[PDB]
Amino acid sequence: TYAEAQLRIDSANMNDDITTSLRGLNKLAKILKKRRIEKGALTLSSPEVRFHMDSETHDPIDLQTKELRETNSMVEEFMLLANISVAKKIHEEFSEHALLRKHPAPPPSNYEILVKAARSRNLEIKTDTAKSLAESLDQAESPTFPYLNTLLRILATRCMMQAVYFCSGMDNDFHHYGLASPIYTHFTSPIRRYADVIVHRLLAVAIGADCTYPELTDKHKLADICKNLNFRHKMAQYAQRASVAFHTQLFFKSKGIVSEEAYILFVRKNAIVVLIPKYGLEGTVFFEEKDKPNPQLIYDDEIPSLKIEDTVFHVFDKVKVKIMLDSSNLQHQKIRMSLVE
RNA sequence: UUUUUU
Incomplete structure (x- = not known):
């Protein structure tokens, strides 16, 4: 486990051969940490959630967000090293009939809204490539609150394109x-991925360690397999996110009408969507349908600020929110937030 | 809607 191995490595007290090998792995992982950002890799994942159960495992009680250890990044960078190695290998051997994974070049319009939000904030961001963007984003640690930097990172995580598998x-x-x-492909999970199964097959046929067949080298069939595995992949995250949304509703439904103060991350033409870190979820409140006459809303586009007769709301602010679940129709049990006038 | 373990 991670806590036990972390106490193995971080303490020089316990010393078998396995812990010595793990400390050597950590010393190599710090060299990977040296080269890591200098390559231009971004490790800025979306805000996760983890339920923790009760005496029954069918109704979980509490909601916790895990703080990651360094050994996670260690096995991360080793699997990245393995994937780069096998990608260059299959590129050298079978660049015409291998399964590869790409991430397309995003348009700068998705970065320009983030640059406008940084202009409202205290920071300028280069939208040229991932290198200058990551360097100017990692230099943006403000002493007012580092969680404003965290909100900037997750808003950058919102702004990306959808990677896919493709046949060459x-x-x-x-x-x-x-x-x-x-160049990149996946190799290190053939248990839970069929793409890694065909990667193992093409690598075993590549060095001549096992017999390949002509159905393993036909290109159009593989392109169809790449389309099928791209279709299956995007549905799975939809299913997982709907699952955590459903469970979250159950958790909220049995905690009544509790409330938080959250941080506003995105602005609607006439609504705003915020994040709550204590439960760590996203939630939108609409300002158009339950509202007063339209002159109480004044919206800007250069900076998307919405202005009321009291005060103009801005991004990255602590706000007054509540949690109430709606069942106006039994389909689509939805989380409503607040009411103001 | 990258990314690594489930």
Whole structure:
């Protein structure tokens, strides 16, 4: 486990051969930490959630967000090293009939809204490439609150394109935007991915360690397999996110009408969507349908600020929110937030 | 709607 191995490595007290090997792995992982950001890789994942149960495991009680250890980043960068190695290997051997994974180049319009939000904030951001963006974003640690930096990171995480698997025979372009590497594929999970199963098959047929067949090298069939595995992949995150949304509703439903103070992260034309860190979820409140006459809303586009007769709301602010679940229709049990006039 | 373990 991670806590036990962390106490193994971080204490020089317990010393078998396995812990010595893990300390050597950590010393190599700090060199990977040296080269890591200098490659141009971004490790800025979305705000996660973890339920913790009760005496029954069917109604979980509390909601906790895990703080990551360094050994997670260690096995991360080792699997990145393995994937880069096998990608260059299959590129050298079978660049016409291998399964590769790309991240397309995003338009700068998705970065320009973030640059406008940084202009409202205390920081300028270069939208040229991932290198200058990551360097100017990592230099933006404000002593007012580091969680404003965290909100900037998750808003940058919101602004990306959808990576996919592709066959090279049918079509060509192999660059990857997110990892700042020229070519990439997945290899290190053949238990839970069929793409890694065909990666193992093509690598075993590549060095001649096992027999390949002509159905394993036909390109159009593979392109169809890449379309199928791209379709199956985007549905799975939809299912997982709907699952955590449903469970979250159950948790909220049995905690009555509790409330928080949250941070506003995105602004609607006539509504605003915020984040609550204590439960760590996203939630929108609409300012158009339960509202007064339209002159109480004044909206700007250069800076998306919404102005009321009392005060103009801005991004990255502590606000007054509540949690109430609606069941106006039994379909789509939805989380409503607040009411103001 | 990258990314690594489930």
